[PDB]
Every structure is written in C-alpha cells, then in structure tokens.
UniProtKB/TrEMBL annotation, chain D:
It is found in: Cell inner membrane. This is Efflux pump membrane transporter. It comes from the Bacteria. Belongs to the resistance-nodulation-cell division (RND) (TC 2.A.6) family. Signal peptide: none annotated. The chain holds residues 52 to 100 of 1036 of the full protein.
Automatic annotation (TrEMBL), chain G:
It is found in: Cell inner membrane. Belongs to the resistance-nodulation-cell division (RND) (TC 2.A.6) family. The chain crosses the membrane at residues 44-63, 70-90. This is Efflux pump membrane transporter.
Automatic annotation (TrEMBL), chain H:
The chain holds residues 988 to 1028 of 1036 of the full protein. It comes from Acinetobacter baumannii. It comes from the Bacteria. This is Efflux pump membrane transporter. It is found in: Cell inner membrane. The chain crosses the membrane at residues 11-37. Belongs to the resistance-nodulation-cell division (RND) (TC 2.A.6) family.
Amino acid sequence: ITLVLAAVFLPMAFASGSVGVIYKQFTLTMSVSILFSALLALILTPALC
Amino acid sequence: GATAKTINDSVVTLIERELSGVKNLLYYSATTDTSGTAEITATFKPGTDVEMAQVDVQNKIKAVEARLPQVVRQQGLQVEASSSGFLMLVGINSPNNQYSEVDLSDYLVRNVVEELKRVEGVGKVQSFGAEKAMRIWVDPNKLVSYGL
Amino acid sequence: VEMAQVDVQNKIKAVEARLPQVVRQQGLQVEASSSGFLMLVGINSPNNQYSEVDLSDYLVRNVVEELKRVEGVGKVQSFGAEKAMRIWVDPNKLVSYGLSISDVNNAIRENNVEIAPGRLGDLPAEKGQLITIPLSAQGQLSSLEQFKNISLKSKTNGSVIKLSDVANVEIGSQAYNFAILENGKPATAAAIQLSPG
Amino acid sequence: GATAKTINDSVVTLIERELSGVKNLLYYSATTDTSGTAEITATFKPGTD
Amino acid sequence: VITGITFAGMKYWPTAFMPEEDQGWFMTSFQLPSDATAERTRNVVNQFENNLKDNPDVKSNTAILGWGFSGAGQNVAVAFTTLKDFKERTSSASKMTSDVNSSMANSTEGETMAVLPPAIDELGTFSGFSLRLQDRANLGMPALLAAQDELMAMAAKNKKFYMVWNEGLPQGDNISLKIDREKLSALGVKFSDVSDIISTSMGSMYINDFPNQGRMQQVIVQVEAKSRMQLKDILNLKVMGSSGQLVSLSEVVTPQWNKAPQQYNRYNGRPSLSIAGIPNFDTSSGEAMREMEQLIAKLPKGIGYEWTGISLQEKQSESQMAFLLGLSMLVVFLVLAALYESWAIPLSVMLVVPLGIFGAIIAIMSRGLMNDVFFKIGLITIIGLSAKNAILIV
Amino acid sequence: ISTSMGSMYINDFPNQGRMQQVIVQVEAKSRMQLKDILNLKVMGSSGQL
Amino acid sequence: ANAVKTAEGVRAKIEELKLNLPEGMEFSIPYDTAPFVKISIEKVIHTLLEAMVLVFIVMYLFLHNVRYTLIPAIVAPIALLGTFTVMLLAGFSINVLTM
Amino acid sequence: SETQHALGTGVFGGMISATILAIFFVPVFFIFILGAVEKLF
C-alpha cells in the first residue's frame, strides 16, 4: 500500500504549465509523508507495542 | 518624436520579430499609445530562470539595432523583469495641508524611495509623484514681439 | 554563448563614444555565431523583370514574417540589399548655379525633418479645459517627387532651383558592394535556421 | 579638471540612484578625491554569480 | 452501469480552474472617453469615493489618477478599496463589487468596472477570462473594431456572462496639420522655422541640471498653459519671413480632423484587441469560455481569437487530465503486478477506481462545486485509497 | 571629399511604413577617372568656388 | 521573493524614517496584501490541528484505550517533521498548497 | 473556506463511496476475474 500510494502521485508532478507546479507541492508532500510513515510503521510501532 | 502609429510601424513590429529565437517563450504582446513610448512584454514557460531569459532577449534584440530608426538607437531599449501586481503602497500625506502634492512628492522621491529600494526583496519602487524642477513658462506672443 | 556575447557588448560600450561619428551613425552590429542552419530560400527573376532590391524588399515585407510562423523556425536572416533613397549630384550642374554638395546636404537635412507630436490640453492645463486632443504634423517626405522638389537657391544669380535640377533622385540600394545572381540573373536568398530544441 | 563636489553631485549620485536596486547587493560605497577620478564599489551577498 | 454514469458525469459536468477567495480588497478601473481632461476623471473618482464613504465596510480607499493596468492617460484611473476584517464586516466583497458597478453605471460619464483580486498572485489583473481578438487576414484596424462592436453586442444579450468589456484606451479624434510647402517657399519662410515653432509649441524640452538644496534637478522650459489649450492658439503662431513680415501658421497649415485608434495593441505578432469578461453565477469559467468561442466563431472571416493568462492555463490543465488519470492507473497496475507476481490479481484491485469516482463526482455535483484542479487531486487521492482498500482484502 | 566620393548618410525617410536611409553622392559618370576628382569644387570664404 | 519579508522590511524602514519626518507630514500604508498570507497560513494550520484531533478521537473510539492509540498518533508528527526536512533540502516553501 | 470545500467535498464523497461499495464489490471482482482467468486458461 505504501508503494502504491507513493507511486500514484508521481506522474502528475511532471505535468506542464502552472498546474504542474501546483501538483508538485501535493505530490512531494504526500509521497514523502507516506514514505516516512511507512518507515516508522516498521521501526517505531513494533518496539512501542 | 513619433505618433503611436509610427512607433508601432517602425519600432514595435521590428523588435517583436526577434522574439521567435528566444528559448522557453510562451507568448509575446506589444502595446503603444500617443505617449512616445512602446512596451513589449514576453511571457516564458512557468518555472524558468528570469535572468537568463532577460539576457537572452537582450542579446536577440540587438539584431535590429542597426535596422532600427537612427533616432531610436541613441535612446536605446531597456529589458527588465516585470511583475503584474503590487505588494505595498507607502504614502505621505499632510493632515494640516502644510505641504502640497509637489512638496510631498519631492520629499518622497528625495528621502524615501531610495531607502525603500534598499529593503530586502524589493523589486521595484514606482513613485506616482515627481521631483522638483525649474519650470519656465514661456509666452510665444512676447517672444515673437521681441523677435526671439 | 549568451554570456560571452553579453560580456562583449558590455566591454565594447566603454569606447563607443570615441568611435568615428559615421560608424556610430551606422551602428556596431554584434551577433553570436549562427550555431543553426536548416535551409536557404531564394527568390529569382528569370524574366529579369525585377532587380535584386525589389526581390529583397518583397522577401522582407511579404515572405520573411510568414516563414517564422512555422513551428521550429527561428532567426530567418536575409542576404539582400536594403532599399534607400539616393541623390546623384552633378558637379558641373552644381557649379553652373554656384552651389556645393554641402548645400544639397543642408537642404535635404533641413526640409526633411520630424515634427514632434503633441497634445492640446496637456497637463498642466488652464482650469476649465473640457477636451484634450492629440495634434501632429508631417515634416518628412515619402515620395520621390517631394525629394525632387526640394528647393535650393542659386548663389550666382539668386534664381530658385530644385534638387532635380542639380541631381537625379531615385530609390536604389543602401550599398552596392555585393550582388547575388541565380544562373546569371538577379536573385536574393535568406537563411532559415532551427529554433533551439 | 574638477572639484570633488562636482563629481560627487553630477556623477556619483546619479549612478548610485540606480545602483541601489540590484539583486544580491550587500552594500555599496563611493569615493571621490582631487584627481578627477571616482570609484563606486558594490559588494554583493556571498555566492553571487 | 456505475462506470458509465461516472464517465458521463466526468465528461459533461462543468469545469473550472481555481476557486475564488475573498482577500479583503477590490479594484475599480475608470475609463473616461478620449476627449476627457483630468478634471472629469477626478470628478468621477470623487463620486466613487463619495458613494463608498457611506459603506461601513470600507477601511481605506486610495485612487491613482492617470495610471491604469491597461493604459495610461488623462481618462484612466485605478482605485484600491481595502475592506475591513471579515469578523467585523458582513459584505461578501463580491457584493461590494456588484453594488459599485450598479451605482456607477447609472450616473457616470465613463466606464467604471469594479473587480475582485485574481486567484493567482501574478496571473492577470482581474478575476475573469481574458481573450485577444486578432486580425489574421490583414482586414485592417477599423474592421477589427467593427468585429469587436459586433462581439460586444452579441455578448450583451447572453445569460452566460455577467459583464464582458474591452480593456484598453478607446478610439479617438486627432488633428493632422498639413504644411503647404509651396506657399511656404513663396512667402520666403524657411521650413526649419515652421518645424521648430510647431514642435516647441506644446512639447516640454529639458535643458540642463541645476543644484537645489544639494541635489541636481532638471530645468524644463515649456510654453505657458494658456497658449496650448486651443487650436487657434497654435495656428496663430507667427513666424518670420524674408520680407520681414510675420506670417501665421493658419496661412500655411490646413487643419484636418480624423478619427482613429488612440492605442495600438499586438498579440503574438498580429494586430489584436484585448477583451475581459466575468462569467455569470451558475456558469463556470469553462462554460463561459466555450460560448465565447462559439460566439467568436460567427464573426467575420479573417478574425481569430487566442486565450491568455489564466484561461490558457485552464485549457492546458483540462487537456492533460485524461493522460494523467490514465498513466496514474497504469502505474498502479504495473506496481501491483510487480509486487504480487500476477496479471489478474492487480486487475481486480484496479476495478475499484470507478467506484471511487462514483461518489466524489456526485458529491461535487450535490454541493455545486465545479471540476477544478483540487477535484483532480482528490480524484488521484481516491485512486490511491481505493487501491489500498482493495489490496487489504486481496 | 567625404560626400562627393563617399556615401553621406543624412537622415531617414518613410517608404510605405518602413524608415529607410537617404544618401547623397556624385553621379557615376563624374567619379570614374582622377581628372574629375581634381575638378571637385569647394566653397570659399571669398565666395568663389 | 517572499511577500512577508519584504512587507516587514518596508514597514521597519518606514518606522525608522518616522524620526526624520518634518512636522506636518505623516506616513500611511493604505494598501498592503501581506496580512492575508499570514491569515491563510494560520487558518490552514488550525485546520490541520483539527484534523489531527478528529483522527485521534476516531482511533480512540475504535481502539478503546489511550495506550493503544498513542502508538499510531506519534507517527504522524514525526513524518511531517521529516517532510519539513525534505522540503528544506529540496527548496520547497511553506505555502497553502503544501499544508 | 471555498478552497477547503473544493479540496474536501470530492475526496469525502469518493472515500465514502469507495469504502462502502468496495467492501462488497472487491470480493465479487476477485471471484469473477480469477474464475474467468482460470476458465480461459
């Protein structure tokens, strides 16, 4: 699910025009957030539990 | 020394033809009026280096300098980065009417505009006033009567 | 190349004022190397009806602009003469009336001039002004006959004469140094380059 | 062949008016002496091209 | 059936680019006719200020007279009306723009248009669609202006637009003096004298700098304002002659009045006229532009149009929606096939996207929101989330 | 000498909307041989060419 | 350039020049667009905080215990902090779209 | 609030519909697709 969600947002970052810049913010933010959350899920939550 | 039509015919059309070579050019427009000046605005692709575009328009516009009317050449052409909107309006007003519009504009240009330009991030400071100067209002009738 | 050209421009600006006045009048042409060459498009007159100047004028006015509307076309450059007005004076006729070529130059420089346009009702304006109207005048000459009718004064006897009397006025080439022939007949050519990427 | 005041009023100030609005500028100084020569230096932010 | 309904809704629902927001200020542009002095524009701006003084919802109202975003002159003015804080203010700035337009339409000499700030910081100057009507067949400026009058007439009777107008200086009259060189030489008056007396009659001429209070300021000499207000004043400018008898201009120059454009505009290398418009409520910015294109289609042959500013970017955004929304799904399919080592299992996970669109599209329909960029981002997010939900079971 | 044998650029004139140079020179027939050049006449203060 | 920095600099310099003003002359700022940016950013941050609170309430009512819910709760702030680090590294700014 | 509504309404409806319809359709999609694939080959 992490890989799917991260891959979903990349294609719209390479668009052309102003919409490309608009979509870049969302793509970067959400993809990096999801990747960091996945990293924490396999690292911190096991020890916490 | 030209009317709007003449500036359009011999300045605007000549300069706009060199814009095709410029890289990352989306569209270009030109405007002239009965004011003795013409403005050609070129828009580039979103997310591009403005300084590179400016230098690459400055280089391209020299192709027509020899062909441009000789009178136009001396004054020259100014290529600069353009923003479409304002950010702040800094004003000086006299509640007691001690100073008039001329004096307020003179003070604004003399002591404030340059200082505001020093502010970090300021791109342009456009003063809607004018500096002080010696105006000689001549009467043609008196001059012709005196032979001058 | 852009920055090298800009540096060249910036450095040559220092000594521009010390150059000969004629050189400054004609101007200094600074341009980077082509770096791009797609094709050459030429116009020729097999019948010999038209000259090189006419072909170049018809290419510049009616062809060059449209050819840049094609996608990927950039910097279409002509290799033809530019039309201009030329006055060929006769020294024998000049001295017949006691004139000099400097007199012809002064007369053409004085009669042919640009009159500055203005606005009636411009600011500051007298209170009570209701309408402001632009106003302009024509001082320059656009036809050959006007240039032939330029008035000169005979120094020998004072009889008014015309530039036609002491000179032949015609529209020809700005320079005659180079000529282009296609199969032995007048022709002009223009190089069409490629836009970046 | 002129006083320092003449060069300061007619040369240094005029250029300094426009020179204020240049990108990456850190500061600028101007010096005029009794030799007919004036020098205006503009120091920019580190790393500027 | 659900997939078909979603496809129909996606295709045939109105679309927009970016929602508008109230930023707390609006802009009023005043365009008096060409034969207007500063006094009349000042009177109109003063009337606007006087009307806005009654509003308890205006904090500051500054006016720049003589400068406009579309042109410069003595018949152009721009006023910035700042609005109080929303908590203490209940006006819905758009309502103030509408009320200003209504008030200024009934008893004002020139056009007075009140507009909202643009959605994007540097895209355009107003909040609406901007178009350039171009003469693509060398039809001439008067023909382009006739086309522009026709288009305005057709747009004025349509319900899909609120107010469509032209941004720029109007057509105006001019005087063209014709110097009679034959009589000029007959009377013995030098041409340079006339060319210099006419040129300096109305034009400011700078000479030299002078020191005032330690600053070098300009010295300008110009004809007195009394002698440059009427045509007779300039036409009564006597000039010297060979015989020594003064000759007036009126004897040698014939005045001629002619009507012609006061501003020349070109777009993409062609003669053009700039047109602005504000779409009417219940019509999106795409819907208004579609009918604008349709109306322009019936204009005389040789006249074309080209969108610019925030309309061109809107078209660009709408064009690539299909490719982006297809490539995203293809990427999900490929990633799932790579992960789960099958071509059928990913297919099952990829059949839920239509269900995701079914519900988002109808939610925006129910709330009345157009198909903007935010909707597209939400669609991508739902593409991802539906795949997550399907994977969890599969 | 500069105007008679060399092209002299004085000003520009409008030809069908394009500004073009105006130039003055001596006719071809009078500048092909050295004899004609030595007969070029210069105005003098006394008033005699 | 950043609007907030420019606006604050202009206002600070104006405040500095108030000392040298002749009597009878007054500065004014009739039109400034800087504040709306801060208002929008603050509103977006408040909406984000409300979203975190609602998500926490949801996880609480399903997991039934604070101990269980704190484990997933602290993942969110750390991921956002990492995203802030990556935005600084890449060059992106804190705008309404990013938030 | 206009931008927030635009960004939120579509995703809200999409998530609701996705969850509700998927929880019942994804098993149907799986059974149908896998059975068809097995039958075809």
